[PDB]
Amino acid sequence: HGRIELIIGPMFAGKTTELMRRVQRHKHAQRSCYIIKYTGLTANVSVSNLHDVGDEWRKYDVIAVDEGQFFPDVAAFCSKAADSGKVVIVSALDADYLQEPFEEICLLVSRADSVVKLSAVCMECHNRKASFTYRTVKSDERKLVGGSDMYMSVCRSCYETKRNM
Amino acid sequence: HGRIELIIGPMFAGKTTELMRRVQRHKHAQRSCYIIKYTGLTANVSVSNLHDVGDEWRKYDVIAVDEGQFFPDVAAFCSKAADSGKVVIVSALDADYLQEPFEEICLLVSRADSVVKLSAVCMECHNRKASFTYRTVKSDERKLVGGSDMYMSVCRSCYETKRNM
Amino acid sequence: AHGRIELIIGPMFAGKTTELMRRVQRHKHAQRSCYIIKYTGDTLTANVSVSNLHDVGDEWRKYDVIAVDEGQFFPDVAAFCSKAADSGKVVIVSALDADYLQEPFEEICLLVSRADSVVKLSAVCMECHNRKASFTYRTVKSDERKLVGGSDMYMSVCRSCYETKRNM
Amino acid sequence: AHGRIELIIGPMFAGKTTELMRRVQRHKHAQRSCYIIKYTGDTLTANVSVSNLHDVGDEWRKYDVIAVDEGQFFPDVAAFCSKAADSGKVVIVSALDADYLQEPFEEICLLVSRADSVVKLSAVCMECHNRKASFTYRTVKSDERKLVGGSDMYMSVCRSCYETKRNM
Ligand SMILES: CC1CN([C@H]2C[C@H](O)[C@@H](COP(=O)(O)O)O2)C(=O)NC1=O
Ligand SMILES: CC1CN([C@H]2C[C@H](O)[C@@H](COP(=O)(O)O)O2)C(=O)NC1=O
Ligand SMILES: CC1CN([C@H]2C[C@H](O)[C@@H](COP(=O)(O)O)O2)C(=O)NC1=O
Ligand SMILES: CC1CN([C@H]2C[C@H](O)[C@@H](COP(=O)(O)O)O2)C(=O)NC1=O
Ligand SMILES: [Mg+2]
Ligand SMILES: [Mg+2]
Ligand SMILES: [Zn+2]
Ligand SMILES: [Zn+2]
Ligand SMILES: [Zn+2]
Ligand SMILES: [Zn+2]
């Protein structure tokens, strides 16, 4: 019946586009899809906790979760949904800007049927595949919502190089 | 320097979405991308022959070709571009509605650095992964432009079942 | 029931046969019966060496999973695979997609269109040692399309090394 | 120069060690020097069996490519891999991501965040023989987290078989 599919990788890797590619496939076969997004045949919702969705998710064949790393209870939610027979698809960062794991996404790795880690292109050297997200502005807040203004995806050596200067 | 990446699979598998996912990645690293589409940092063109693009493609780092199976000279074009150092990305059907290969895309398989075959979800049984495109209207024209009105993506056994009734 | 065709392609030295046997082993842990077909001129589950698939007869019907190694040597491979997958077998094929001139094996091209799954593996360039390799370069002088051998006669190369070497 | 960490995860019987050796062999065809590290309690390129990575010393610096099998047994694996990849090695690790209770090996979770590449393989469900399997079920009674063994003590299962069996 149910499964969990997980899409990880650094920023700018196209994780959300891949999540939607998959949702679309299911829609062409007349499956009902429920898309959950974060905020500080089809359906959408922006929420800050998966609790706040209630039981609405049970009306759907496929549940998609975007920015899974911002939801504190995401692993338990996905397991509950997959145990009820849903196809659960999650896009998330695996690593924060210090290359430290989001603990909840780690738990999802252990529970997932499928895991794909996408890469980006290094925004520093423009020559290599990038697996890390470097924060270009000086906060020590773990969560800090932003775009290419505040983050770059970089290859391993550019991450190091920048970490010096 | 150059490569060729090929994305294949039946209709409704999200090949064009994957092609664009990849283009977008390159754009975030400030690479210039040139997108070619068929008709009967960025740039677009609809054309019916790759000849009609001329040498415009040389101004770009990345060349993307959508619906590669409609272009008669696509293999030679891609090889020329990759030999000049371009990253060439092609989305195409590998098989026609009779499960017979597009000969030019076969040639691209042999020349590609990378090949991915995406699947769809079976639009007949809604239960299995689909690798074939079944034409639901009665032409014997190989080329016949259309959507879900005239085609379904199906699994192997649904393809057979329908081929009877 | 649910037959399928899985195809593994790529140049020589890419590990295609290893990937094939990885997949077989998975099935074997679940007690699936697996039959492995190799090519006769080529130099423990149920195994046979044949020079065409017709010489296997109907023996393949006794198995859940049929694995075909060096598929490019068999002239009737597409039809065999389709017949087996229509009978409900999982059919797994390892094959070169391209010959040493980068021209396709036509029968494998047919298989691409019939496959549920296609993976193209790469090797590491054996000329420059720096890039992924997608082509096989023949290092001995023969114009015979078929010429069985190993790293004594072939090497896998990246796109620019293939060109460079072709000038010599 | 261009170091990286490649991680192969999935449950038991998924072929992770075979995939690791597939990758090593590719590198070896391009004459890269490859070093293979196995776990000591565990039951030909340069090979060593150790119970932690610190006991390899600096021997790993003599190779282009470092392969670590059963990474979940090594307590210092993330740091070792990062140090090696920062020195320019290609580091390839095979490991269970989850234990028999479906709880993560924390050190492997760290590696996911540090890896350039992560692949999670599946097995075939050894209970129902019909579905892909992502979990390892321990078939003997031990509450020790670490318990070395094979199909004598474990089987890989799909999500519903894991549940079903857990009731017994
Ligand atoms: C690396 C990051 C990213 N972020 C943010 C930046 C973006 O708003 C978001 C990433 O979007 P993504 O999952 O890649 O579509 O998470 C953090 O809050 N903390 C970190 O350490
Ligand atoms: C299976 C097909 C499809 N087509 C068409 C239908 C669509 O216009 C197009 C597929 O779009 P795609 O590459 O999957 O984005 O090709 C044919 O002309 N002949 C065939 O035999
Ligand atoms: C590239 C090749 C390889 N071969 C042979 C050499 C080997 O015997 C066999 C290996 O292919 P494999 O990668 O094992 O499936 O194919 C040819 O006969 N003609 C060619 O053009
Ligand atoms: C699931 C396991 C497996 N193991 C052991 C059993 C095997 O010796 C080893 C195999 O893992 P592999 O798939 O080879 O990397 O890991 C545990 O010690 N604890 C568990 O919870
Ligand atoms: Mg082989
Ligand atoms: Mg192993
Ligand atoms: Zn870089
Ligand atoms: Zn179907
Ligand atoms: Zn080379
Ligand atoms: Zn099962």
From TrEMBL, chains C, D:
- Kindly list the residue ranges recorded as spanning the membrane: none
Q: Give the organism, scientific name.
A: Trypanosoma brucei brucei (strain 927/4 GUTat10.1)
Record's protein name: thymidine kinase
Residues noted as binding Zn(2+) in the record, renumbered to the chain? 125, 128, 158, 161
Family under the similarity heading: Belongs to the thymidine kinase family.
Entry superkingdom: Eukaryota
Q: Where does Mg(2+) bind?
A: 17
